[PDB]
């Protein structure tokens, strides 16, 4: 009962009206508008006031009316979207962070050396003899990884010292918080995450340059242990003891299923927004439609999940500019 | 009377219909229903009862076409007088206004009587034409 | 100690990049929501946002080249349109007319911002139908068996009632009768472009693309006009009034002549298919186009022409060697209104 | 001690599936390499192999339906149809795109046209010119990653990972101009109305090569339909020929009548489409006149998230009457080069004897 | 104008004689399956890629069969080394389908060396030994399946009772793994746990039973993302103390690749498996052979859609190699690849 109408440019150039007009334009613009509505519903639910289980949940962060999970992939940190995600972590707009190994270290490396633009068609050989690594259409000099080892080794030495002298049991979340404390840069995501008591989870932290650094470091000062069983209870109890949950996942892979499995323990989530470019014809979990997660209890049967088939680097800044940026005052 | 309207959505196979001003018998019928072409339409293929030509036409499913009225009679043709077709009409008169079917088929009726074969001559009456074609 | 080969492989020495390289930098919202500045950060953000920014720059270059005053007309061509400093081809698919993008393309046609239009058969039928009945919103997951029983046709996530096609027929049959007659008495030779211009004249609605196309003398080309509902309605009408002829060779001459006698050419294509190849073949006559922007979602791994990169057109001469075409891998309904809001809407009063 | 509610979600009670449920099995290589069994095992392997098996079953059903003898007492309208081809129990439409002729699939399509296994052919403008050119010059292999500047300097055109020299197109003009001259002469001196299908049928008689698809198509009286025939190399040749001998006219209204009547007067219809574009919608529009098709098989690599027609699922065509409600259409999400030879190796090849 | 004729018609150069022509398979000779699959190399777009992959795998197989003539102390492994070490990586959904039978054939006959998978690909193989998997459709609705307790994976259906039989099998085992940790000083890693589970399943149809019987290491960096994580979470409430260390497996997989004469890679899909194997091979300056089979694209900058040429940029593959990627669903092309390679050489793997 809703007609199809575009935006008439004879009225001028009004950006708010132009972004509102996507709800009735067509194929993926309708999905973008529905995603905007879902995120707005999340935001309005969160701001409602409550009327005590810090011991059970092992969390010193205070409780709210809606717990938000934010998951992202590694290649979105090498882009400018890093400057958007940080904006949400700086002002306590989210509750749980989920990422991969490569999505962590590239945030620290960016605090020491920059990244440049390139092209998709560059040959790999000449890039190899010149010591330049390619990520999509971005170029990273190899010299940036020589800065990371020098900054990283003493931290590992201190961690090994504290494991034996003080009986400290290390898990990926604790290691990420420790690394975020040491960088001491206000432009980093994980500095603000640890300053605001926001847990970050990464089940596979050894798949990246951190793994190589640990492997080389273990030949001199061995004994580092990273447990993952302890890190699973935390993320499960975050979802179990929540009044309401919402999910925002950019991409797919480990983080998508890891958030969905945690939300399964409370019989599903109440809101969900997906932004990725995967297709479901090969039976992969990455490309699964949101209606498949309803089948095995990851999403509630009465919810209205939305998926947008687009690149996140084009959609996420527009989504944030329409939902979170308009409620800046209420988050003070 | 000799011609009456009828909705061509209600026609059936082996009926009769006026196709391009000809009393044709329907041999094929189909319906395209309603969709992207605009309306339900009927495709009719018919064979003439006198000549034998094939006609084709297309109906909108709601409008009307004319169905003719055909009268079936079998006349008394017993005996050949003076070499002509002495039709023994029950009207009390004799006339040769009815000609033979064009070709050698019309010759097939007169020459078989000398061979001792009876024929049930049938004269077909149409909406506007008086010609004898049907033989049985 | 750790093996030396592993350390020599993991940790090499790089070579410093020239200072001409641009750094990756996004947009921070601590400065507020400035919409003009937010859309300029796309050029330095990431993967496809950079392509969007380069497309903006290419279209701006087209527009700036067009407005330079012209210093003759070669009016031998069957064209009543004067010659400018740059001729622009705009090509689009049929599914983009059924959406709201119809209201954007029309904005460019009403204000004489483009020169040649290329589309398919559906892109005319749906535009003419939308002036008689509206189109609604649906879902991708609706089942066809229950949709057919209620007389509703699906296009993506859009719904069209059957009755919308009942009105169009009623509006089209009287026109066709007047087109066969002129074919017999006045000796008029019909081509798809002439028929589209006639339909645009007949619709008489300021919200229609082709009404403004015919009012501003903008040619519209469509090599395959019989693939759709228009062809279906022509097929049924020929049972009462046979003898309709549509010729496709004069259209080829007309479109190929536009590129030959052009000072400069540019192309804007949304999607792929026959509209992309037809424009590329037209521009091959002048050894290639000077500017080009592509927006489609196809991929090249199957060898199709739709999924072809802009680099193949250089190989067979459709695009000049010394040009920089740009392609954006995105849905047009999300990036075309944003592209227009930064290039054509800004230079609005200069097209009077 | 775990929370009770959380234990009610992971360990949810289930139901029992109906007994007519197929399990999942692969092919065991311990028995050796048996190719027929290996290919039959695709029906239970998984995601896309199941679609491949279902497509095989659909094509086999088509073939079984076609071979049924007619009563041979029917009128079999030939004057209303304008066809010299006798009618069978099932009419088959075969549609394909341009790039599939530049590859080896051309030797797979011709095998079906040489032996009277299909009824109607639908393609694009490139699919005719490439097939005719292949009878004069050959085509070579290449790479997907090749710079266009160097290729253009040396005059070699790229189609995916295939290379075509320019001299292949120089041979086409010399062979093509006299035929066009004769066509224009016959248009005026003998009163002949030209349509794309008639022109395609004319060019297959001139190549006179048993390795050509359209030679066997015209030899067996198989119609080939192409709405946009001016989009390709042949269009440029006609454009340049028009400057010396103007007057050539191609009409596209008669081909529409021919292709629609081919489907109106059919006992049963089936569709096999490789790719998308104008051929897919053209065949669907032709089948709309008879209220849909009975069997259908799609093979292309297009997705539907952008509201396109090429990526449309077979269930969308049911909504507007292109496919019947009680049919079982199948789509395979795979490249046609890898799949079509395997589909023909199982159907149309095990029944070679029955088609003679 | 003559300029247009200078654009459509141009002079060209002669191609080198070492150029292969395009030619398909002729069906007038009958259906010869061995020659039909050989004609893919000169057929077209992706069939050429299939032929190149066949050649690459055959090169790997021939290299592996060359006899040697070696230090287990550094590698800490019992498996003897050959002239070529092969890594095989796969995703979770490929074990839920019929490709699970093709992998076991290679594992059963010592045709590969290292296995890399995800958490789901380990639990699905063990669950399949207790209950079967059925066939469904891609378009089945969610809440209707949820009410009947059926989980959908692509077009495959799994009842929840399967997970109720798995838990019963798993809880007694986990208890023991705690005891040995507190008494015998056992330090558990995911690979050791996978080996123990494969030994316990004791079914000749299982991949990991043959993997542990032939001393083939299996690696999974994230073992807590799936059903195993859920069972461990529920078990830790009454028997707490289980610890899984991931650093030692990182050491083991790297030392498996450093001390090798030659390396080959076969990866089915993308994700963490591809990057994990590539990072393992980076420590020897690259791999000699590589074959990829996945359906991901590169326009979004993802690692899964990365071309094989991008791995050359950061030293994952050698410069002088010829990597191949096939853009197709693995369930259609992996059995055909094993029909031409690893199967014609059966007699040489006794
Ligand atoms: N509603 C309809 O789609 C419709 C209606 C009537 C007739 N037809 C007939 O369909 C045939 C095919 O038409 P076509 O070639 O224009 O369409 P198509 O869907 O066959 O091909 C469109 C091409 O552009 C791409 N594309 C489609 N939508 C896009 C989008 N929103 N953004 C970016 N790329 C996009 C596709 O992937 C493909 O490469 C024509 O003969 C036409 O007359 C279509
Ligand atoms: N070599 C050429 O491609 C060539 C040559 C001359 C002219 N042309 C012109 O190009 C235009 C477009 O050609 P088209 O409409 O036939 O197709 P296309 O190239 O536009 O492809 C349309 C769709 O077909 C499907 N497809 C293509 N190749 C496939 C494959 N190998 N396997 C599976 N699916 C596949 C995809 O969905 C694709 O988006 C036409 O106007 C044609 O005349 C092409
Ligand atoms: N049944 C399941 O899928 C299942 C079950 C339990 C847990 N999980 C968890 O899901 C997470 C994500 O799974 P993943 O990372 O192993 O892979 P994934 O499902 O994210 O797929 C990754 C990529 O593999 C490729 N791919 C997938 N299927 C393919 C096929 N048939 N042919 C070719 N290429 C194909 C595609 O490029 C795809 O994008 C894992 O952490 C896993 O433990 C999955
Ligand atoms: N720069 C890097 O990417 C990098 C660096 C070092 C290590 N790694 C390691 O790579 C491993 C595997 O990669 P991953 O799973 O983290 O990421 P990935 O890029 O491989 O994930 C691919 C999935 O995310 C989707 N996706 C990715 N980018 C997208 C985008 N911009 N828009 C939309 N969808 C998008 C894909 O479509 C697919 O579903 C991780 O364990 C990581 O630590 C990556």
Numbering used by the authors:
A (entry chain D): 28 to 78, 83 to 363
B (entry chain E): 15 to 150
C (entry chain B): 8 to 78, 83 to 363
D (entry chain A): 8 to 363
E (entry chain C): 10 to 78, 83 to 363
The authors write:
The initial step of hypusination, the formation of deoxyhypusine, is catalyzed by deoxyhypusine synthase (DHS), however, the molecular details of the DHS-mediated reaction remained elusive. DHS catalyzes the transfer of the 4-aminobutyl moiety from SPD to the modifiable lysine (Lys50) of eIF5A in a NAD-dependent manner. Recently, patient-derived variants of DHS and eIF5A have been linked to rare neurodevelopmental disorders.
To understand how the binding of eIF5A and DHS facilitates the deoxyhypusination reaction, we used single-particle cryo-EM to determine the structure of the human eIF5A-1-DHS complex at an overall resolution of 2.8 Å. We reconstituted and trapped the complex using individually purified components, namely eIF5A-1 and the catalytically dead variant DHSK329A (we refer to the complex as eIF5A-DHSK329A). The complex structure is composed of a single eIF5A monomer bound to a DHS tetramer. The binding interface is located between two DHS protomers, which almost equally contribute to eIF5A binding (interaction surface with chain A 489.6 Å2 and chain B 564.2 Å2) and can be explained by DHS active site complementation. Overall the eIF5A interface constitutes a large surface area of ∼1054 Å2, which covers approximately 12% of the total surface of eIF5A25. This interaction is mediated mainly by a 3-stranded β-sheet formed by the N-terminal domain of eIF5A. The highly conserved hypusination loop of eIF5A (46SKTGKHGHA26) enters the DHS active site through a distinct tunnel and is stabilized mainly by three helices at the DHS dimer interface. The hypusination loop thereby unlocks the entrance to the active site by displacing the ball motif. Finally, we observe that NAD binds to all four DHS active sites, while the SPD moiety binds to three—all but the one occupied by eIF5A. Interestingly, we observed that the indole ring of Trp327 is shifted perpendicularly in the complex, relative to its position in DHSwt. The cryo-EM structure clearly indicates that the wild-type position of Trp327 overlaps with that of the modifiable Lys50 residue of eIF5A in the complex.
